[PDB]
Structure 1
Amino acid sequence: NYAPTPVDRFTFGLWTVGWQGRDPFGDATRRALDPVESVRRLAELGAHGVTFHDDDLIPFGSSDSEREEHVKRFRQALDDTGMKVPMATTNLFTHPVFKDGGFTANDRDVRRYALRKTIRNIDLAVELGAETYVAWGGREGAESGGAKDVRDALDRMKEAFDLLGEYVTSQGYDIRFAIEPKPNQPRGDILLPTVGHALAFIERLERPELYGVNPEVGHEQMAGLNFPHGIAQALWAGKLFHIDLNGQNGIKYDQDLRFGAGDLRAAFWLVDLLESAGYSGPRHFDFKPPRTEDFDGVWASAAGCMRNYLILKERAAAFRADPEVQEALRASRLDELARPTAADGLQALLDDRSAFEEFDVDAAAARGMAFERLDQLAMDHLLGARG
């Protein structure tokens, strides 16, 4: 039951199942995986595709001949399995040169290098068929207040993204960009810390249509925010270009648990939203099998990501299709929320005594919302306990 197929568009980063287990306090617990191994194993589990940072696929500093051989082997694995590559990204965070940032490093020479590193990888992403290019500015930020003038840093970040937009336009590429917010870690505070801040920034770019967001479940939850609500705002703005699925237990370091772990009810409401809205992008997992696991546990954890999505999809669909739930949604006036407040227009509203002088505020205030019954129907559906 709940068996994933490529149809479900489940994707995984090479760095997810390939995470060797090094953490702030501990050495690696697993050997490095050849990307070819990961592609073949993920395909066997029913994944649709993989994603990569440049330096996951091509060791940093590789010669041109080494780069070609790494890409050739990877493409053979994709061809052997039918796996796709819908998204790629640049590693602008691991190498010590990026310790103060890539695009917003105080040192101008580093900013220029970061752009050139990204541009090289955009070319590769396009050659592999990627539709989306993600940017996670994990080093953009500060541990202290004097270190980073945020207005200047935002100017530099806009300049960088505008140059990348000029680049893809000039080459005729169809790829689009997706900015991944995170509030903190590894920097004390990271620039563009939430979906909202990223959406706001995009509106000030020269070609805003080329940019959207790549929200990650656990990153919004590291600020204690409601991930489904933030996804709703991204959808409302037309900017949900990609998504990163995982789990998180609240306000902690970025745990990258398998999807469904962490906040299970938020996972339910997320799947309900994505499916109801008809989100058509990859269901991408940015997770880490815990370092306690051997490789059998790696593949079990990856399989669990997909399984949990499919269980939640079934339960959310049953919730929405249940005539008792539909009645409860009407009892709670969800239908009214979807109707305009004043399609009659401003003057008619100002002239409408039913909206002020003759509005019976105490009668209105007496009406219960019936939200608790609705929520218990949702709980019963999630748990398969209807009756």
Structure 2
Amino acid sequence: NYQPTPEDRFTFGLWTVGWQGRDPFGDATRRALDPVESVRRLAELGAHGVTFHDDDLIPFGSSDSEREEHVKRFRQALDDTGMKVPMATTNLFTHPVFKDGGFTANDRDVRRYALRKTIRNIDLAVELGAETYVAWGGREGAESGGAKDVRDALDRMKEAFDLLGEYVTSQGYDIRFAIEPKPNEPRGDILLPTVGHALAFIERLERPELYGVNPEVGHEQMAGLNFPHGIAQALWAGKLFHIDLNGQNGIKYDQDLRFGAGDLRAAFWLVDLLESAGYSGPRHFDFKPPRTEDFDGVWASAAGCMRNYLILKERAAAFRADPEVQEALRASRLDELARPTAADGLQALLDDRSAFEEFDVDAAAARGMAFERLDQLAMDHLLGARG
């Protein structure tokens, strides 16, 4: 049961299944993977495609002839399997040159290098068929208050994203950008730390229509926020261009557990919302198989990501379709929430004595919301315990 197929649009970063297991306190526990092997093994599990940072596909420092050969071998693996590349991104965080940032480094020469490195990889992403170009500014931020003037850094961030938008327009590319928030780690505090901050920033760009968000489950949860609520605001804004799916157990280091692990009920409400809203983009997993695992465990963890999405999709659809749930939603006035407050207009509201002078506040206050019965029907559906 719950078998994934390419039509489900599940995708994985090369760096996910390829993670060698180096952590803040430990050496690698697995050998490096050839990208060709990852494309083949993910296709065998029912994935739709893969994503990459520049430096995952082409080792940093490669000659032009070595670059050509790495791309040629990867394209053959895509052609052998039917796998797609819907998204790509730039590594602006591993190399020591990026220790104070890429686009917002205090050193101007590093900012210019970061833009040239990104532009080179936008060309490659378009050649491989990507629709979305992600930016995770993991080095943009500070450990101390004097190190980074945040207004100046936001000016540099806007300048960078405006130049990238000029570039893609000049080349006639159809690709769009997606900014990925994170609140902290590896910097003490990261700029644009949540979905809200990234959405607000985009409204100051010269061409806002070219930019949206790539929210990650565990990143919003590292600020103790409700991930489904933040996704709802992104959808409300028309800005959910891509998503990163994984798990996280509360406020700690970025765990990148397989999807479904961590906050299981939040995963349920997330899938319910994506499916109800008709989100059509990739279901992308940004996860780390724990370093306890061998290669067999890597593929088991990847398979589990897709399995858990499909279980949750079934249970959320059954919840929404149940006539007893539909009655409970009316008892809780979810239908009234979706009606305008005052389609009669401001003057009519001011002249309505039933809205103030003759409003029975005590009778309204006495009416229970019936939310606990609704939520226990949701629990029963998630757990397969309906009686």
TM-score above 0.5, yes or no: yes
Map 1:325-336 to 2 at 5 A: 325-336=325-336
Counterpart Cα distance in 1 of 2:192 and 2:62: 32
Give the secondary structure class of the aligned counterpart of 1:50: strand
Give the secondary structure class of the aligned counterpart of 1:84: coil
Counterpart Cα distance in 2 of 1:325 and 1:98: 52
Map 1:250-329 to 2 at 5 A: 250-329=250-329
Counterpart Cα distance in 2 of 1:44 and 1:347: 64
Q: Report the Cα offset of residue 88 of structure 1.
A: 0.1
Give the secondary structure class of the aligned counterpart of 1:138: coil
Q: Report the Cα offset of residue 120 of structure 1.
A: 0.3
Q: Report the Cα offset of residue 241 of structure 1.
A: 0.1
1:134-161 Cα distance to aligned partner (Å, 9 max, x none): 0000000000000000000000000000
Q: Report the Cα offset of residue 338 of structure 1.
A: 0.4
Counterpart Cα distance in 1 of 2:172 and 2:360: 60
Q: Report the Cα offset of residue 6 of structure 1.
A: 0.3
Q: Report the Cα offset of residue 332 of structure 1.
A: 0.4
The CA RMSD over aligned residues, in Å, is 0.3
1:176-218 Cα distance to aligned partner (Å, 9 max, x none): 0000000000000000000000000000000000000000000
Q: Which residue of 2 aligns with 1:197?
A: 197
Counterpart Cα distance in 2 of 1:30 and 1:130: 29
Q: Report the Cα offset of residue 167 of structure 1.
A: 0.3
Counterpart Cα distance in 2 of 1:52 and 1:223: 26
Counterpart Cα distance in 2 of 1:184 and 1:125: 28
Give the secondary structure class of the aligned counterpart of 2:377: helix
1:32-67 Cα distance to aligned partner (Å, 9 max, x none): 000000000000000000000000000001011111
Q: Which residue of 1 aligns with 2:235?
A: 235
1:214-252 Cα distance to aligned partner (Å, 9 max, x none): 000000000000000000000000000000000000000
What are structure 1's unaligned runs of at least 5 residues? none
Q: Which residue of 1 aligns with 2:101?
A: 101
Counterpart Cα distance in 2 of 1:164 and 1:184: 25
Counterpart Cα distance in 2 of 1:351 and 1:112: 61
Counterpart Cα distance in 2 of 1:344 and 1:79: 59
Counterpart Cα distance in 2 of 1:56 and 1:273: 32
Counterpart Cα distance in 1 of 2:358 and 2:19: 64
Counterpart Cα distance in 2 of 1:358 and 1:74: 72
Give the secondary structure class of the aligned counterpart of 2:85: strand
TM-score, length of structure 2 as denominator length: 1.00
Q: Report the Cα offset of residue 105 of structure 1.
A: 0.1
Give the secondary structure class of the aligned counterpart of 1:85: coil
Q: Report the Cα offset of residue 266 of structure 1.
A: 0.1
Counterpart Cα distance in 2 of 1:35 and 1:330: 51
Q: Report the Cα offset of residue 383 of structure 1.
A: 0.3
TM-score, length of structure 1 as denominator length: 1.00
Counterpart Cα distance in 1 of 2:343 and 2:66: 63
Q: Report the Cα offset of residue 86 of structure 1.
A: 0.1
Counterpart Cα distance in 1 of 2:8 and 2:384: 22
Counterpart Cα distance in 1 of 2:112 and 2:62: 20
Q: Report the Cα offset of residue 368 of structure 1.
A: 0.4
1:289-340 Cα distance to aligned partner (Å, 9 max, x none): 0000000000000000000000000000000000000000011000010010
Q: Report the Cα offset of residue 16 of structure 1.
A: 0.2
Counterpart Cα distance in 2 of 1:347 and 1:268: 43
Counterpart Cα distance in 2 of 1:354 and 1:54: 63
1:88-143 Cα distance to aligned partner (Å, 9 max, x none): 00000000000000000000000000000000000000000000000000000000
Q: How many residues matched?
A: 387
Counterpart Cα distance in 2 of 1:223 and 1:150: 20
Give the secondary structure class of the aligned counterpart of 1:124: helix
Give the secondary structure class of the aligned counterpart of 1:340: coil
Counterpart Cα distance in 1 of 2:163 and 2:355: 51
- The alignment-based identity, stated in percent, is 99
Counterpart Cα distance in 2 of 1:206 and 1:368: 48
Q: Report the Cα offset of residue 282 of structure 1.
A: 0.1
Give the secondary structure class of the aligned counterpart of 2:112: helix
Give the secondary structure class of the aligned counterpart of 1:177: strand
Counterpart Cα distance in 1 of 2:52 and 2:170: 24
What are structure 2's unaligned runs of at least 5 residues? none
Q: Report the Cα offset of residue 24 of structure 1.
A: 0.1
Counterpart Cα distance in 2 of 1:143 and 1:362: 52
Counterpart Cα distance in 1 of 2:276 and 2:340: 21
Counterpart Cα distance in 1 of 2:27 and 2:205: 41
Counterpart Cα distance in 2 of 1:350 and 1:302: 58
